[PDB]
Subunit: 276 residues, 3 copies
C-alpha cells in the first residue's frame, strides 16, 4: 500500500499518431508500462499537449467518476490542460456477506476515451493505449515483460510485417501482456509455448483446472497476460507469434520470440551466406 505519483503526457507523434509518455517528447506506442501492487494508489498528473480533448481511462482498477476519463463524467482534459487522475487498487478479502471480493490484480490497460469520438475511437486508433499490471503479494516477477497490442490489423501500430520481435535466453521467465483494440476479433497464437487461461497464465498447482492453451480468441479491449519459461521443453529458436486468423497472419500480424541458447546463438539463424 504505497502512494505513488507519476507524470504522463499525451502528445501527437509523426504520421498522424498519438501516444502517451513519461516526459514530453518521449511518448511511445504502446504507452509506458505501469506496474502496481494490490493496495497501491497511483496519482497520475496528466497533461494533454494536443490540440484536441484527450483522456486517460483504465480497466480493472478502482477510480471514482472524476477519474472516468469520459465526456459523460466531464473528466477528460482540454487541449493544453492538466488533470490528476487517481487509480486505487485493493487486495482480495472476505466481505461481510460472506463472499470473496476479488482483488485488483491482473493484466489490465489504459487508453483514451475522448479523441475522435466519445469512445476514444480515434485516440485508440492513433496510439493512445498502454499496459497496466497489478500484482498480488507473492506473485512471481519475470526477467522481462513484453507488450503485444493487436490494434485493428496492426501490432503496436507498427507497419505490416514489422514485428515487434522480442529476445530472450532459454530458461528466462518471460512475461507477455496481450491487449486488443479497435474493430476486429483476433486469435493470439504462439509457436512452442503455452500458458494457462487464468489470472497469471500459470497453473497454481495440480488442483487448478484452468485450460492450458496456445491460441486465444480476443476482441476489442480484452487483456490477458502470462509467463513462460523461454524454450521450455522446446529449446532455442525463432518462435513465431501471430494472429491465427489466416488473412491476418498473411497480411503481417506476425512477430518473433527469439530464444537464444545460453551460448548466445539461435538455432538455424543464418542471416549471411558463407563462401563454398
Amino acid at each position: 500500500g504505497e502512494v505513488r505519483r507519476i507524470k504522463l503526457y499525451a502528445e501527437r507523434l509523426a504520421d498522424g499518431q498519438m501516444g502517451y509518455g513519461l516526459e514530453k517528447g518521449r511518448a511511445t506506442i504502446p504507452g509506458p508500462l505501469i506496474e502496481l501492487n494490490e493496495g497501491d494508489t497511483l496519482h497520475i498528473e496528466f497533461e494533454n499537449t494536443m490540440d484536441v480533448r484527450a483522456s486517460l481511462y483504465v480497466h480493472g482498477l478502482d477510480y471514482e467518476v472524476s477519474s472516468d476519463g469520459t465526456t459523460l463524467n466531464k473528466s477528460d482534459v482540454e487541449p493544453g490542460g492538466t488533470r490528476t487522475y487517481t487509480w486505487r487498487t485493493h487486495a482480495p478479502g472476505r466481505r461481510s456477506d460472506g463472499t470473496w471480493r476479488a482483488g485488483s490484480a491482473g493484466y489490465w490497460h489504459y487508453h483514451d476515451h475522448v479523441v475522435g469520438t466519445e469512445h476514444g475511437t480515434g485516440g485508440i486508433r492513433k496510439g493512445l493505449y498502454g499496459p497496466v499490471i497489478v500484482r498480488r503479494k507473492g506473485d512471481v516477477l519475470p526477467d522481462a515483460t513484453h507488450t503485444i497490442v493487436f490494434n485493428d490489423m496492426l501490432i503496436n501500430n507498427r507497419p505490416a510485417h514489422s514485428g515487434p520481435n522480442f529476445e530472450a535466453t532459454v530458461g528466462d521467465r518471460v512475461e507477455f501482456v496481450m491487449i486488443t483494440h479497435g474493430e476486429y476479433y483476433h486469435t493470439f497464437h504462439m509457436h512452442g509455448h503455452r500458458w494457462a487461461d487464468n489470472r497469471t497464465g500459470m497453473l497454481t498447482g495440480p488442483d487448478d483446472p484452468s485450460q492450458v492453451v496456445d491460441n486465444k480468441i480476443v476482441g476489442p479491449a480484452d487483456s490477458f497476460g502470462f509467463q513462460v519459461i523461454a524454450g521450455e521443453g522446446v529449446g532455442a529458436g525463432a518462435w513465431m507469434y501471430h494472429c491465427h486468423v489466416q488473412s491476418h497472419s498473411d497480411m503481417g500480424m506476425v512477430g518473433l520470440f527469439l530464444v537464444k541458447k545460453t551460448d548466445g546463438t539461435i538455432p538455424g539463424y543464418e542471416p549471411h551466406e558463407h563462401s563454398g
Copy 2:
C-alpha cells in the same frame, strides 16, 4: 425440488417486434426472467398468439426432443396454437463411473427456433429471447437482476443510444445476465465494476484462479452472468456499460448503470 407451472405467450408487439410475456398484452423484450433451483421442474403452458409458427427453445436445461422447440422434432407451435414445454433441472453428483456430473446451474436463456428460418433468425431478431437463471443450493441471491442482450447491433432491441439504463444504490448486490444473439461478435464492458469469469461471476475464495475481468468477448447464443457490489471501491456515479468494439459503441451500443448514494443522489453527468 419443486414442480412449477407458468403461462407464456408469444405476441407481435404494437411496434412490430415479437415478445414473450407472462400475460396477454404484457410481452416484453427481453422476455420474462425465469428463475429455478436445481431439481425444479417447470411446465410452461405456452400460447402462440401470432399468425406465423413460433416456438420455445432453452439452453442448458434438461428437456426431451418433444420440447426442443424445433421443426426437426415437431415441437414448434402453429399460429394461435398451444403447447406445454417442460424444462427439468438436476443437481450435481457422482456418477457410478466415478466421474462428476455437472448440475444445471448457470446463466441460461430461451428463444424462438422457427420464426423466419428453422433457426429462429427472425424470431430472435424481433425480440423472442429471454433469460433463465438456475441456482445451486447456497448460491448468493441478489437485490436485483438486470438482463442485457446484445442482439445484432441493438441492446434489448432498444434504438441506438437509448439504454437501457439500470438503477441501483451503493452497496446493493446487483446481478447481470448477459446474452448475445444474431450475427456479430461483441465485447461486453462495464466501467467501474469487474467480475470473475466462472459459473457465478464471483470467486469462490482465495484459491479460485479464475480470470477477473471487465471485458468479455461474446458471440451469438453465449450467455454468462455475474453479481457486483454496486459502486464497490468506486462510489456512486453513472457507470457506462457498452460493447467495446469501437464502431458498435459509437453507433449506440451503450447504456448506464446509475449507482446512487443512499440519499438517492448521483454525481452530475451529461448523457448523449
Copy 3:
C-alpha cells in the same frame, strides 16, 4: 512414456482438396486422430506426395524448431519428399523453484503451415488439418471420439447442409474434439448436451468452478474438447449441433448427434 512411430502422408484429393492419411490413398478431412499419453514421444515419418511444398505443424505439444513445419525454420517438405517430425509430451510437475509446470494434456490439432502461403492458408483451406488428443494419467476414456472442424463456413470441408452426423446409444460416453480454422469466428452449440469449459469438458468434482456451457465462441486455430453421456437427462433424439451465428446455421453449418435407444430406434426420425 512410450516411444511411438507412425507414417503420415499428405495427398491431393478431389475438388482441389488436400488431406493427411495414415496409408497412401487413405487421406481424410479431417486427418487421422492422433492420441498420446503425457510423456509419450511420437516420430511421424511424413511423406509429401503432392507437387507443392507442404508441412506438418502441431499445437500444444513439445517439438524443436526442426519440427516447426515452417519455412522460417526450414522444416517443411519438398514435393515428393519425406521428413521425420518428432513430437514430445510431458506430464505436469513442480519445477525446482516450486512453480507448477503445466502438462501437455489437451485437445490439440495439427495442420499445414506452407501450402498457399507461409501460414498454410491454402493448405488449411483445402483440408490439411486433424486432431491430436494428449491424455493425462487417470483420464476417463470414451466409447467414441468425433471430430468437428469449422473451417471457414464448412464443417470438415463438407458441402452446406451435409452433416456430418454422428451416432451413439443412450448412455455412451462420447468425446467431441472441436477445431476452428480460417477467417471467421463461430459459436459452437449442441442441443440437449452441455460440458464444462475446462480441459476435459467434465468438472473435476464439487470444487471446480468452471462455467458449464452449451455454446462457445471460437476462432481460427482454437481447439477444445469434451465428453458427454449421450442423452443424459434428455433421452434419445436427433440432437442438432450447429454454429449459432444465425446466418451460418441458416446456411448449413448444422449436423446431428443421433442418440438411439438401446433398441436402435430414435424418436420420430
